[PDB]
Design an enzyme around this catalytic site. Structure first.
Site, PDB file in Angstrom:
ATOM      1  N   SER A   1       0.863  -1.168   0.000  1.00  0.00           N
ATOM      2  CA  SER A   1       0.000   0.000   0.000  1.00  0.00           C
ATOM      3  C   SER A   1       0.901   1.220   0.000  1.00  0.00           C
ATOM      4  O   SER A   1       1.736   1.370   0.895  1.00  0.00           O
ATOM      5  CB  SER A   1      -0.930   0.019   1.210  1.00  0.00           C
ATOM      6  OG  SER A   1      -1.849   1.089   1.114  1.00  0.00           O
ATOM      7  N   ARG A   2       0.748   2.083  -0.998  1.00  0.00           N
ATOM      8  CA  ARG A   2       1.667   3.202  -1.125  1.00  0.00           C
ATOM      9  C   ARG A   2       1.371   4.340  -0.155  1.00  0.00           C
ATOM     10  O   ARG A   2       2.105   5.334  -0.154  1.00  0.00           O
ATOM     11  CB  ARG A   2       1.668   3.732  -2.560  1.00  0.00           C
ATOM     12  CG  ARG A   2       3.005   4.339  -2.975  1.00  0.00           C
ATOM     13  CD  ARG A   2       3.071   4.651  -4.456  1.00  0.00           C
ATOM     14  NE  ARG A   2       4.418   5.058  -4.853  1.00  0.00           N
ATOM     15  CZ  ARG A   2       4.746   5.450  -6.078  1.00  0.00           C
ATOM     16  NH1 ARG A   2       3.824   5.493  -7.028  1.00  0.00           N
ATOM     17  NH2 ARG A   2       5.993   5.803  -6.354  1.00  0.00           N
ATOM     18  N   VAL A   3       0.335   4.234   0.674  1.00  0.00           N
ATOM     19  CA  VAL A   3       0.104   5.258   1.688  1.00  0.00           C
ATOM     20  C   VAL A   3       0.815   4.900   2.991  1.00  0.00           C
ATOM     21  O   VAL A   3       1.657   5.659   3.483  1.00  0.00           O
ATOM     22  CB  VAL A   3      -1.404   5.498   1.892  1.00  0.00           C
ATOM     23  CG1 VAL A   3      -1.933   6.334   0.755  1.00  0.00           C
ATOM     24  CG2 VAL A   3      -2.167   4.198   1.959  1.00  0.00           C
TER      25      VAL A   3
END
Ligand SMILES: Nc1ncnc2c1ncn2[C@@H]1O[C@H](COP(=O)(O)OP(=O)(O)OP(=O)(O)O)[C@@H](O)[C@H]1O
Ligand SMILES: Nc1ncnc2c1ncn2[C@@H]1O[C@H](COP(=O)(O)OP(=O)(O)OP(=O)(O)O)[C@@H](O)[C@H]1O
Ligand SMILES: CC(C)C[C@@H]1NC(=O)[C@H](C)N(C)C(=O)CNC(=O)/C(=C/c2ccccc2)N(C)C1=O
Lengths: 478, 51, 502, 72, 125
Positions: C364-366
């Site tokens: 997850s890039r967050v």
């Protein structure tokens, strides 16, 4: 004096317009459709001629949406190809495919407008000097020395680390140049463009007080924006960079993310443009379409453009026509591997497929060249016996083959590195490694000195003295 | 007896590894076969429509 | 090229009847050549591209191909009873749907028409179906969590409001249990949920809607459903109508979640549509415009700036893969469009590990931008221990360093596995998630029975949610894992262990 | 360089010129060949000529063969 | 091919002597037809050959025959494209020949010239 035409047909983004019998517009001339979409009158539908179909009718491609367009609308032709603002007025601003600022900072001063279609620089006006530049990345600096002034491509599938590599290169090299560095989103996540812009503002690069001195220029045609825009956003970015190279005689950087989407939008357009496709459903004018874009990105006696491009490989197919044609224009490729990415080895740069035309004993020196050759030789031996050691295992190899396996594993661990832009994923903040440190570390690995320490001591570190520090920490912690 | 036991465990490991390799090979081959059939028929129909 | 569609004789008879005159057939088009999801209508001279056209049978159409003498439209249904030579009427309205707040709790058929059987839906008409996605200045970075209830997701693949997270796996490996868990977890949060079923069998939609209704998640949910027998145009359109319905709320400072069940089925419907329109296809007969198909849809899920009301749309697309083909066409396209994925594996799913997240290949890039402070503090050690188990299980049969590795893999990996598995349609609150991760990854559950880990965990959860309400208060107050809550949870788990032993 | 000619045709050249460049070089060499002189010619990236020819044939609506390459 | 075959037909039939007919690549006789076939308007067959591959091969092959008054021994080289022994052109030749003789690139790669595949080269004698 301007031609007024009628829309004859509308097929998605591709529409053809009927002109008076006397005067028809030339190829690539911009055409303004007046337009009416639940408002007063926005002329935002700009097109450009592709082919003169005969009987007073030309066929264009819209740089906007064509929903709500009627047959019989008036089409004013501009009598010239799409010209975009150039110069210092573009510094610190975000732009469209049409040179229209999307930053909500005001209108751009459009004194100097140069057209997006030009010819490449002549053969006599070309640099012949060969310089490399270090990037801080071990595998890049060792195995694929990036040429200064040359086109550089990054090939990877979906989610292997193309954008983290581009952003690491921007973090390392973009703040060192004296010339401007333009960025063009040629079809990518608008989230990423917004994130990069906010990072630019917080860093000070794009100063909201005085925009006039920023040394960056951002062009964006993202994954929306019908294929008329995604096909020419690269051209308007290239035009803006060519102004700084030619006129100001600066040394420009040209970071482009997914020049593959330029090709993809070209094939999308050419499907409805009524052409027979090539083998993989691409446009028949694919190679010259890539050439008309890449042959303008050069280094003349005036200035240099160092371009760093990401190249998507669809379904991880390096034989696909789009990367297969990008390879010819590049001069320092860097291929990312899904296997290396899944094995945690970041960056996922495939060491043996990633080459460079600057890995030569006359350009990088004999010590660098010999160390790179020995690294590639042990990696090639490992890749050879990979399937045998996959079925049987290491227990059956000879002593020299087991030593080569262990050394190749230490090399492929010392290739990974922490990035400043990936501190959220890995932690253990990024490391910049010079070239001399990489050369000494690989001399140390291959020389047999660092032969009695764990492989994990080399994983995700820089500067092999840190590998030794990590090995000492691991043995003392047990 | 200890050498034969080591051989038994090594051949068990090699059988399991060749099993997963055979699985991966069968997957890649099915993909190649579907891609070959697709490309062949697309080429044939492209030629026919061009006529 | 030698033939045309209005080449039919009656039109030429009418044209020879009078050559030069004043008025043409302006809104009146006579259908001809009803084909395969297309109808080449002669007339409609003033028609716009994207125009809704209404047939005599009742079928809606969209003016796609505006040729010189005929407009070719696409049928929004089984246009069987479209009699040839019959009238067609333009509506002047580009393709749009009625949008309102009266949709919350209904079922919809990709045309905003209720298949619910509960009457009509009032509306103040808006929302062109193909709305533009927000620009660069319009949106904002993601900063607040969107809790799914699943411990593994919320700990290691955290998702924030405004992120496009892909749910990718085989068939019958989950992804709909996961989607429904995330929707049922939005009971307290102020989040509208949209669920588009694009090609599911009608019984699957029945089960999902009845589960929603029974568990109470229908007061804030809309359902757009196109079954397997629906026309390919409706399955092609349904996620765009879902996106417009969710954008209605998103542009009114409210947070939305949208779930496109089987976005690959929309890609297959679009491939059918393109092959029937005879467009030259690319690899595996896909149109080549299929990336644009998915990306112009997924770019609408955003996190708007403070000027635009701070509204958000979270997208949870779903892609089925064939024999786990990560590197296929539509999987890789959706991966290159979204902001991280969640890999469900058929192997772990059938081996009993039921939320089958393949954590080593799902990102997850967050990350910490989405996670709250407590979840960061408690999940660091958790992702570390599962990282260790990742190499340990694949590499070592018995162990290397047999003493601590049997203290490593047994105490951590094989018990954290039972900690992560979660029943069908049973989400967890964030306090229970933080507590459950803390009980495991610090080293407190190192000696239980492997079949008693689940029972101990659920009973300790009810105990702390009975005896220690000040823990839940100090967590839902500051969202951080203070030493006070830490110590009182320690004495709580000691009490609960000494209670559960007898 | 006092014994060689260079026939350049970059990638931004039209497909007609890239298709024709090997024949231009071959006629150039054939001149010296029939003037009793020994010649040596090198067509670097001949597959690029085949691709330029395929582009020209597809644009002329000539029916394609294997991999869109013309029969000839 | 038909020119040379006619010259051999005369020596077999009118002169009644045993003819020895050697042919170079008969693959070229088929690919020339496949080259012109698109321009002749014919629709493409399997992977790109003319729809008349089998009959075009058969006419010329059946014309080669020992006719009980003279004999024609015919030795033909058949180019197998991309070592695809199941390509249509060699596939339709196999049925016309008597003693086939397959050549293996695996034997040429080590020097077993003549690199004749022993298990593939069959014969009816
Ligand atoms: N150097 C790195 N260190 C740690 N993780 C990485 C690194 N590079 C990539 N990743 C992981 O890979 C994922 C995908 O990376 P990224 O999106 O930057 O590349 P990409 O998808 O190939 O390129 P694009 O974004 O242009 O499609 C990221 O979520 C990240 O977690
Ligand atoms: N966490 C879980 N615990 C228990 N059972 C589960 C869980 N997740 C899924 N299942 C069961 O597994 C079956 C398949 O799950 P699910 O419905 O989520 O997959 P799916 O999306 O329908 O797959 P497909 O749509 O490809 O058939 C369902 O019948 C469900 O009851
Ligand atoms: C899905 C509908 C409601 C929006 C369409 N618009 C688009 O697809 C693209 C994104 N845009 C913006 C265009 O302007 C060109 N229009 C079409 O391609 C289309 C394409 C289309 C394809 C298949 C069926 C109908 C239409 N339109 C006419 C549109 O209106």
């Amino acid at each position: 004096k301007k031609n007024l035409g009628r829309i004859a047909q509308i097929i998605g983004p591709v529409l053809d317009v009927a002109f008076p019998p006397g005067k028809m517009p030339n190829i690539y001339n911009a055409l303004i459709v007046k337009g009416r979409d639940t408002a007063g009158q926005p002329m935002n539908v700009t097109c450009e001629v592709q082919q003169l179909l005969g009987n007073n009718r030309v066929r264009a491609v819209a740089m906007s949406a064509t929903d709500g367009l009627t047959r019989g609308m008036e089409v004013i032709d501009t009598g010239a190809p799409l010209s975009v603002p150039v110069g210092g007025a573009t510094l610190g601003r975000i732009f469209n495919v049409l040179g229209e600022p999307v930053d909500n900072l005001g209108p751009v001063d459009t004194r100097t407008t140069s057209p997006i279609h030009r010819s490449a620089p002549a053969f006599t006006q070309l640099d012949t000097k060969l310089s490399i530049f270090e990037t801080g990345i071990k595998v890049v600096d060792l195995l694929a020395p990036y040429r200064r002034g040359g086109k550089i491509g990054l090939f990877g599938g979906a989610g292997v680390g193309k954008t983290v590599l581009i952003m690491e290169l921007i973090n390392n090299i973009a703040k060192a140049h004296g010339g401007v560095s333009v960025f063009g989103g040629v079809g990518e996540r608008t989230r990423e463009g917004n994130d990069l812009y906010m990072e630019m503002k917080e860093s000070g690069v794009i100063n909201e007080q005085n925009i006039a001195e920023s040394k960056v220029a951002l062009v964006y045609g993202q994954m929306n924006e019908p294929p008329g825009a995604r096909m020419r956003v690269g051209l308007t970015a290239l035009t803006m960079a060519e102004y700084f190279r030619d006129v100001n005689e600066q040394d420009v950087l040209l970071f482009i993310d997914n020049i593959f989407r330029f090709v993809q939008a070209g094939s999308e357009v050419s499907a409805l443009l009524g052409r027979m496709p090539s083998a993989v459903g691409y446009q028949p004018t694919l190679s010259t379409e890539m050439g008309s874009l890449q042959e303008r990105i050069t280094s003349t006696k005036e200035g240099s453009i160092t371009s760093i491009q990401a190249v998507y490989v669809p379904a991880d197919d390096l034989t696909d026509p789009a990367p297969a044609t990008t390879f010819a224009h590049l001069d320092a490729t860097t291929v990312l591997s899904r296997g290396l990415a899944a094995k945690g080895i970041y960056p996922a740069v495939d060491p043996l497929d990633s080459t460079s035309t600057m890995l030569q004993p006359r350009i990088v020196g004999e010590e660098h060249y010999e160390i790179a050759q020995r690294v590639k030789e042990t990696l090639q031996r490992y890749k050879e016996l990979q399937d045998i050691i996959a079925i049987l295992g290491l227990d059956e190899l000879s002593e020299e083959d087991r030593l080569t396996v262990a050394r190749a594993r230490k090399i492929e661990r010392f290739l990974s590195q922490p990035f400043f832009v990936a501190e959220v994923f890995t932690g253990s903040p990024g490391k910049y490694v010079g070239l001399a440190e990489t050369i000494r570390g690989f001399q140390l690995i291959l020389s047999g000195e660092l032969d009695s320490l764990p492989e994990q001591a080399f994983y995700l570190v820089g500067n092999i003295d840190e590998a030794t520090a990590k090995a000492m920490n691991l043995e003392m912690e047990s | 007896a200890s050498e034969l036991a080591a051989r038994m465990t090594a051949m068990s490991n090699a059988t399991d590894n060749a099993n997963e390799l055979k699985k991966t090979l069968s997957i890649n081959y099915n993909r190649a076969r579907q891609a070959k059939i697709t490309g062949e028929i697309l080429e044939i129909v492209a030629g026919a429509n061009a006529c | 090229a030698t033939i045309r569609a209005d080449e039919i004789s009656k039109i030429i008879r009418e044209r020879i009847e009078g050559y030069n005159r004043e008025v043409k057939v302006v809104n009146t088009g006579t259908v001809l050549q009803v084909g395969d999801g297309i109808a080449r209508i002669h007339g409609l001279d003033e028609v716009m591209a994207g125009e809704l056209v209404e047939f005599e049978e009742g079928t809606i159409g969209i003016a796609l191909n505006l040729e010189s003498n005929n407009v070719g439209v696409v049928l929004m249904g089984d246009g069987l009873m479209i009699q040839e030579g019959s009238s067609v009427k333009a509506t002047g309205r580009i393709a749009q749907i009625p949008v309102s707040e009266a949709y919350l709790g209904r079922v919809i058929n990709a045309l905003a028409k209720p298949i619910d059987g509960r009457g009509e839906i009032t509306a103040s008409e808006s929302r062109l179906i193909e709305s533009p996605a927000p620009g660069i200045m319009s949106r904002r970075s993601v900063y607040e969590p969107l809790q799914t209830g699943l411990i593994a997701i919320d700990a290691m693949i955290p998702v924030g409001r405004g992120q496009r997270e892909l749910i990718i796996g085989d068939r019958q490996t989950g992804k709909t249990a996961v989607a429904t868990d995330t929707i049922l977890n939005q009971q307290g949060q102020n989040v509208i949920c949209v669920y588009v079923a694009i090609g599911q069998k009608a019984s699957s939609v029945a089960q999902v809607v009845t589960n929603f209704q029974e568990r109470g998640a229908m007061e804030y949910t809309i359902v757009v459903a196109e079954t397997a027998d629906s026309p390919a145009t409706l399955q092609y359109l349904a996620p765009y109508t879902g996106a417009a319905l969710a954008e209605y709320f998103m542009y009114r400072e409210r947070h939305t979640l949208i779930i496109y069940d089987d976005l690959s089925k929309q890609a297959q419907a679009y491939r059918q549509m393109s092959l029937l329109l005879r467009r030259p296809p690319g690899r595996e007969a896909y149109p080549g415009d299929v990336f644009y198909l998915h990306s112009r849809l997924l770019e609408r899920a955003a996190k708007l700036s403070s000027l635009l009301g701070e509204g958000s749309m979270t997208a949870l697309p779903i892609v089925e893969t064939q024999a786990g083909d990560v590197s296929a066409y539509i999987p890789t396209n959706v991966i290159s469009i979204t902001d991280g994925q969640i890999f469900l594996s058929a192997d772990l799913f059938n081996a009993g590990i039921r939320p089958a997240i393949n954590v080593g290949i799902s990102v997850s890039r967050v990350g910490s931008a989405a996670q709250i402070k407590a979840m960061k503090k408690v999940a660091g050690k958790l992702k570390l221990e599962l990282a260790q188990f990742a190499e340990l299980e694949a590499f070592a049969q018995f162990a290397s360093d047999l003493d601590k590795a049997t203290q490593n893999q047994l105490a951590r990996g094989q018990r954290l596995r039972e900690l992560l598995k979660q029943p069908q349609s049973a989400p967890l609150t964030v306090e229970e998630q933080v507590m459950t991760i803390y009980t495991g990854t610090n080293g407190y559950l190192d000696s239980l029975e492997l079949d008693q880990v689940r029972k101990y965990l659920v009973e300790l959860r009810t105990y702390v949610k009975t005896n220690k309400p000040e823990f839940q208060e100090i967590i839902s107050s500051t969202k951080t894992f203070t030493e006070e809550a830490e110590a009182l949870l320690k004495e709580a788990i000691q009490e609960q262990m000494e209670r559960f032993l007898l």
